Amino acid sequence: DAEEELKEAFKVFDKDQNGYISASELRHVMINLGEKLTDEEVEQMIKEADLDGDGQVNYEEFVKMMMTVR
Numbered sequence: 873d874a875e876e877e878l879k880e881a882f883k884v885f886d887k888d889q890n891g892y893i894s895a896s897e898l899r900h901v902m903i904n905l906g907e908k909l910t911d912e913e914v915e916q917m918i919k920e921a922d923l924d925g926d927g928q929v930n931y932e933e934f935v936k937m938m939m940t941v942r
């Protein structure tokens with residue numbers, strides 16, 4: 873079920889449904905959660921979470937990042 877719930881949530885964040893979560897999509901989520909971090913904080917999270925420096929948070933990075941903070 874973990875892979876399901878995780879896949880589902882991922883599908884929600886993937887507003888563009890491009891298979892990759894964009895920084896903008898992450899920010900919108902933060903607002904929905906009632907949380908707002910500085911641009912430098914979010915930018916750092918994307919960079920820190922991104923293992924391939926692709927600039928985009930991929931499922932592996934998301935789950936991985938999610939596992940970290942959890």
Ligand SMILES: [Ca+2]
Pocket residue numbers: 885886887888889890891892893894897
């Ligand atoms: Ca997207």
Ligand SMILES: [Ca+2]
Pocket residue numbers: 922923924925926927928929930933
């Ligand atoms: Ca990536």
